[PDB]
Amino acid sequence: SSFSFGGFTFKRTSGSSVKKEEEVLTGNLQTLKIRVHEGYEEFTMVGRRATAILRKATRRLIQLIVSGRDEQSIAEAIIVAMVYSQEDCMIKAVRGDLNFVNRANQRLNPMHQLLRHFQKDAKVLFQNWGIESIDNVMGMIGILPDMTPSTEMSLRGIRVSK
Ligand SMILES: O=C(O)[C@H]1[C@H]2CC[C@H](CC2)[C@@H]1Nc1nc(-c2c[nH]c3ncc(F)cc23)ncc1F
Ligand SMILES: [Cl-]
């Protein structure tokens, strides 16, 4: 069965995961209690303006292949995938006001809290994610933290289908 996150419809296409609650420490030193998915899984992500295929494991993005209508729509998909990955570099990229601990009995979803944080401005997320050298795969291109294309380098695990 499918579920929506960040305006993408997710469908699990392979694998499985078990759940473990973990109290992580954000970059601005707040505690979030997140349900960590442990396992090796593949998802499709279908949005109104971008599509992606995500392979991930426990708190790790392994591969994301993305297509979309413009740079902004591609970036939107990437930010959703980087939060959904639950990666420590994404948790440590949170900056600014302590606006996760301030909601009283609202009990907001920590994954949605993170997403709304990074949708505001993903520059620190992209700068801390990491880049790698890429193989030359015809029809695929790298995307750098400034969302410009590269034939040589890319955000770690991420490729754009031109
Ligand atoms: O935990 C949640 O409240 C929700 C919100 C935050 C992410 C998902 C979509 C919205 C999550 N829902 C679901 N996640 C997942 C799920 C599998 N592997 C994952 N890895 C990381 C992750 F993060 C969520 C998942 N499966 C079924 C779901 F139905
Ligand atoms: Cl929420």
Author numbering: 321 to 482
The authors write:
RdRp of IAV is highly conserved among influenza viruses. It is composed of three subunits–the polymerase acidic protein (PA) with endonuclease activity, the polymerase basic protein 1 (PB1) with polymerase activity and the polymerase basic protein 2 (PB2) containing five-prime cap binding site (CBS). Host five-prime cap binds to the PB2 cap-binding site, then PA cleaves 10–13 nucleotides from the host five-prime cap and PB1 synthesizes viral RNA. One potent inhibitor of the cap-snatching process, pimodivir (VX-787, JNJ-63623872), is a cyclohexyl carboxylic acid analogue inhibitor of host five-prime cap binding to the PB2 subunit. We have crystallized proteins of PB2 wild-type (PB2-WT) and selected mutated forms PB2-H357N, PB2-F404Y and PB2-M431I in complex with pimodivir and obtained four high resolution structures.
Mutation F404Y did not severely disrupt the viral growth and retained near the wild-type polymerase activity. The selected mutations in the cap-binding domains decreased the binding affinity of pimodivir by factors of 280 (F404Y mutant), 7 (M431I mutant) and 130 (H357N mutant). For the F404Y single mutant, the enthalpy change for pimodivir binding was substantially affected and was 4.8 kcal.mol−1 less favorable than the WT value. This change was only partially compensated by a more favorable entropic contribution of 1.4 kcal.mol−1 (referenced to the wild-type value). Since the thermodynamic analysis showed the greatest loss of the enthalpy contribution in the mutant PB2-F404Y, the structure was compared with that of PB2-WT in detail to identify any visible changes that could explain more unfavorable enthalpy. The root-mean-square deviation for PB2-F404Y is 0.08 Å up to Cζ. A considerably less negative ∆Eint of the pimodivir: PB2-F404Y complex can be indicative of the less negative enthalpic term measured by isothermal titration calorimetry (ITC). The H357N and F404Y mutations caused a considerable loss of the stabilization “free” energy for water molecules 1 to 4. W2 and W3 became even repulsive upon the F404Y mutation.
